[PDB]
RNA sequence: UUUUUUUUUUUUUUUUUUUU
RNA sequence: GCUUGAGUCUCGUAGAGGGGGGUAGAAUUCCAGGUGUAGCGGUGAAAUGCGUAGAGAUCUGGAGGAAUACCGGUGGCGAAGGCGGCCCCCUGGACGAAGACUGACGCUCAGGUGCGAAAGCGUGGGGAGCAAACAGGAUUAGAUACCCUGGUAGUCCACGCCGUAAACGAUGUCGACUUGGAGGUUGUGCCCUUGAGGCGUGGCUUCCGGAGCUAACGCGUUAAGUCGACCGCCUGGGGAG
């Protein structure tokens, strides 16, 4: 929902060698920048609940893909949180 | 009370749940341009307006006329007025001056205040109705076309511009919608400022009706030295009108100057 | 740039007012940078129903590649115009560029 | 038949009660009929297909 | 079928074998191919084959006698968690002596008879009769 | 819904408006309409007509 | 799929055994 | 280690839109005055108003209240409900696809979370036309009535405790089920597209087919015949909601 100024910068920062753009630390950096962008414009339209369940569903996934990553790969998980916080 | 900020009364913890709880609308000093209202009734001599108790009136807001039209302006604050329940606000005009204006609900930002012949349609001081569109809200209405504001307050009395009615003879209002007055009168827009102070009871009492006056409380009941009734023994029981002048329907008017009412469907 | 197919009806006999009044409607469309696929003087044509009593209109149609920021302004400056009988707006499923 | 210049030539499908007849009579493919239906709709509301006798 | 490993093995030999076929074919599984084997070697089916060896399919020649299913009187009795482990003399002895059942235990899948004679209890897969 | 007669010897050419507008419009409305129960009835009638 | 030409008419007691 | 259950991108495609917005159009009241004179509504039969202070209607001039009449369907969507014109914004669900990226992050749920048809509480009203109550004229074995003019509430609802009953495969979760064959529809691969669709083929839906199962109607594989993960309800009269 944000621009390719931030999202090429997410791929550069959270990838590891080649084609990582949809990989687990890139998808979670994605989803934490995308919420944090939607949190900038959700301030508008005043009746916006048509929109909102997206923002809500994608934060429940951010929490969930973290619950998964801990179990899968403890290095991946623990190095991710010192860049993005998100343990919530 | 269903608007926001609604400001609700407390829990039942004390004798006063209401009055109004609004933060952010009393300030001091009473700023340079002000005045008061004088003594008790003193009409000269045998006073006709009953029960009195007339101390502490007290201060009023000195801005009428308000004809400062096309000089643009901006908004420092909004306040209260306890004489009218009103949402009155501090308007700095960009020539070099500060006023007190009868503004609607949340007209601050500090906004884009400006009015007059053709120049604007915006939030606007006092605005001639012949120059501007149709709408529901109007407010000021110069009561006859050069006199001044019919409504000094934004208390919900929606007076409503109709479009092409009768050559400029607009407004669709409260007790007689064929009031028929010319669109050469001035509006402001609009009539909802403080709903909250008047959509609910302030008190049984509160300060508004005991620290500086008495309201009505009696006329008929007790002592026959006044009204046409009624013996004693707690009985009364009779035919007792409001003499010589009548009550629960009759009308009072025949003739007067203006007297433009034209249909007045009553009820 | 929605492809607004907009039909507007002005007063029938004002053949001298309308050539310039299209210039006073297009002036909102160029402002937008939006653009005219077709723009039709339909003439003094008769009416389906008795609206605004002179039993004809001066019909104008256009097909504008213009954004949503103009159409409530257009709607207003047709509606506030006491010479405008009725005015209506269709949109999208490509552009029309062929006359009627 | 999606747009204007063809429906001014197809007013044959208007029966005398002033309405658009069910295609039993010629037998058209669904895509083409469902195109012409929307070409007709824009021509209705714009009076370029001037629906029944007095309008 | 994954909610009950390996139960569909007993339903599929009922279905196809009622339904006019001399044949049925499916993906293989950790108990099914031993069941296929015992069903032939007792003779309740005519053959079985297994095919695509490196990731194989499992194929049984059903016994379409009179157009009715041989495995019409069948029941798969042991279910998820609520297992049926029975001692070497608690085992099935059904149809007044004519038998039989198919089990699994400490030597593979086998008939209840061949289990009783090896002197072992086990997992009661199905009452074949 | 507007229909001439010519030479008018009481011609009675006025007859073709029975197609819908004059004559068919009474399906709903008579005093009174039907109000409840006419909606699935329109498509119920499609089955009585198969002959 | 509009279906008010008047509203009502007390309890009984009939009752050809039986296993098949 | 995989079968990729699960998603986020990429890329497309329409309708009676979850919430705020803009709002297109018959009748017809009753009036300013333009008229024809006595008759207009109403019924199993007519009535109380009414009529030389003219029964409507019908023009012209005006003041108010604001359904969706249909390309509208021999139909379209939807979790139910439940909207009928079209549009601007928030842009539900989806879900037809070159794929990319991670490998069960999964299904299905009780207490709760939301939603919640009838109805009361509203708090202030938006105050057509019809019609419970309202108000009678009338048909009178009593009508405490149904008419017929007159009549509100229901129309709908900002906003929110709403349980809730007829929202029944008298019925969830579903994967394997591959005799099937016939329609009703939707999207789509391939054709000298001489073509009413030929060869195909999923989805949405219905039709209604053996071995079995089996009373009587017949139901005949996804359907009750196999196989199963539970969050359940199931304690007999009358005691009861």
Q: What structural class do you assign from the helix and strand content of chain A? A: mainly alpha
Measured by DSSP, the beta-strand proportion of chain B falls in 5-15%
What's the number of helices of chain A? 4
End-to-end separation of chain B in angstroms reads 27 Å
PDB class: ribosome
Keywords: ribosome, translation, accommodation, tRNA selection, Ribonucleoprotein, Ribosomal protein, RNA-binding, rRNA-binding, tRNA-binding, Endonuclease, Hydrolase, Nuclease, Antibiotic resistance, Repressor
Entry title: Structure of the E. coli ribosome in the Pre-accommodation state
Chain A: 30S ribosomal protein S15
Walk me through the structure.
The structure is cut from a larger assembly and holds chains A (about 90 residues), B (about 270 residues), C (about 100 residues), D (about 55 residues), E (about 130 residues) and F (about 50 residues). Chain A is about 70% helix and about 0% strand. In chain A, helix 1 (about 5-15) runs antiparallel to helix 2 (about 25-40) and helix 3 (about 50-70) crosses helix 4 (about 75-85). Chain A has 4 helices and no strands. The radius of gyration of chain A is 14 Å and the shape is globular. Chain A has about 90 residues and is mostly helical. Chain E folds into 2 domains: about 5-70, 2-Layer Sandwich (Ribosomal Protein S8, Chain: A, domain 1); about 75-130, 2-Layer Sandwich (Dna Ligase, domain 1). Chain E has 3 helices and 7 strands; from the N terminus they run H-E-H-E-E-E-E-E-H-E. With about 50 residues, chain F is an all-alpha fold. Helix content of chain F is about 20%, strand content about 0%. Chain F has one helix spanning about 40-50. Chains D and F meet through loops of D and loops of F. The structure holds 2 RNA strands.
């Amino acid at each position: 929902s944000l621009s390719t100024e931030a999202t090429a910068k997410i791929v550069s920062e959270f990838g590891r060698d080649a084609n990582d753009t949809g990989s687990t630390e890139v998808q979670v950096a994605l989803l934490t920048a995308q919420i944090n962008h939607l949190q900038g414009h959700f301030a508008e339209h005043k009746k916006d609940h048509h929109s909102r369940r997206g923002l809500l569903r994608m934060v429940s996934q951010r929490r969930k893909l973290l619950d998964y990553l801990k179990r899968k790969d403890v290095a991946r998980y623990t190095r991710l949180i010192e860049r993005l916080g998100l343990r919530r | 009370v269903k608007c926001k900020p609604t400001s609700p009364g407390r829990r039942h913890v004390v004798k006063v749940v209401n009055p109004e709880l609004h933060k952010g609308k009393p300030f001091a000093p009473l700023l340079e341009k002000n005045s008061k209202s004088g003594g008790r009734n003193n009409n000269g001599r045998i006073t006709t307006r009953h029960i009195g108790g007339g101390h502490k009136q007290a201060y009023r807001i000195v801005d009428f006329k308000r004809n400062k039209d096309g000089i643009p302006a901006v908004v420092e604050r909004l306040e209260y007025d306890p004489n009218r329940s009103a949402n009155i606000a501090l308007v700095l005009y960009k020539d070099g001056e500060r006023r007190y204006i009868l503004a609607p609900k949340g007209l601050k930002a500090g906004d884009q205040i400006q009015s007059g012949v053709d120049a604007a349609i915006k939030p606007g001081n006092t605005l001639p109705m012949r120059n501007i569109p149709v709408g529901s809200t109007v407010h000021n209405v110069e009561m006859k076309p050069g006199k001044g504001g019919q409504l000094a307050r934004s208390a919900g009395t929606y007076v409503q511009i109709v479009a092409r009615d009768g050559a400029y003879v607009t407004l669709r209002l409260r007790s007689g919608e064929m009031r028929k007055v010319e669109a050469d009168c001035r509006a402001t827009l609009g009539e909802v400022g403080n709903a909250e102070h008047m959509l609910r009871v302030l008190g049984k009492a509160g300060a508004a009706r005991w620290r500086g006056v008495r309201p009505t409380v009696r006329g008929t009941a007790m002592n026959p030295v006044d009204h046409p009734h009624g013996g004693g023994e707690g009985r009364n029981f009779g035919k007792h009108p409001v003499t010589p002048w009548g009550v629960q329907t009759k009308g009072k008017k025949t003739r007067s100057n203006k007297r433009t009412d034209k249909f007045i469907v009553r009820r | 740039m929605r492809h607004y197919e907009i039909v507007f009806m002005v007063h029938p006999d004002q053949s001298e007012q309308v050539p310039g009044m299209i210039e006073r409607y297009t002036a909102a469309i160029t402002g937008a940078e939006g653009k005219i696929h077709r723009l039709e003087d339909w003439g003094r044509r008769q009416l389906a129903y008795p609206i605004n009593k002179l039993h004809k209109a001066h019909y104008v149609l256009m097909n504008v590649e213009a954004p949503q920021e103009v159409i409530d302004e257009l709607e207003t400056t047709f509606r506030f115009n006491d010479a405008v009988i009725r005015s209506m707006v269709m949109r999208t499923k490509h552009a029309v560029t062929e006359a009627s | 038949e999606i747009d204007y210049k063809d429906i001014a030539t197809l007013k044959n499908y208007i029966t005398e009660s002033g309405k658009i007849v069910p295609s039993r009579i010629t037998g058209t493919r669904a895509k083409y009929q469902r195109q012409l239906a929307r070409a007709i709709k824009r021509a209705r509301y714009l009076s370029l297909l001037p629906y029944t006798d007095r309008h | 079928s994954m909610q009950d490993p390996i139960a569909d093995m007993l339903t599929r030999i009922r279905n196809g074998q009622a339904a006019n076929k001399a044949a049925v074919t499916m993906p293989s599984s950790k108990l099914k191919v031993a069941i296929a084997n015992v069903l032939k070697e007792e003779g309740f089916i005519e053959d079985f084959k297994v095919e695509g060896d490196t990731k194989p399919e499992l194929e049984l020649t059903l016994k379409y006698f009179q157009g009715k299913a041989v495995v019409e009187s069948i029941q798969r009795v042991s279910r998820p968690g609520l297992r049926i482990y029975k001692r070497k003399d608690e085992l099935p002895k059904v149809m007044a002596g004519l038998g039989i059942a198919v089990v699994s235990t400490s030597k593979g899948v086998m008939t209840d008879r061949a289990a009783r004679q090896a002197g072992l209890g086990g997992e009661i897969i199905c009452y074949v009769a | 819904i507007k229909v001439r007669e010519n030479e008018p010897f009481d011609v009675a050419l006025r007859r073709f408006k029975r197609s819908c507008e004059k004559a068919g419009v009474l399906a709903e409305v008579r005093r009174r309409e039907f109000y409840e129960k006419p909606t699935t009835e329109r498509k119920r009638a499609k089955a009585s007509a198969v002959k």
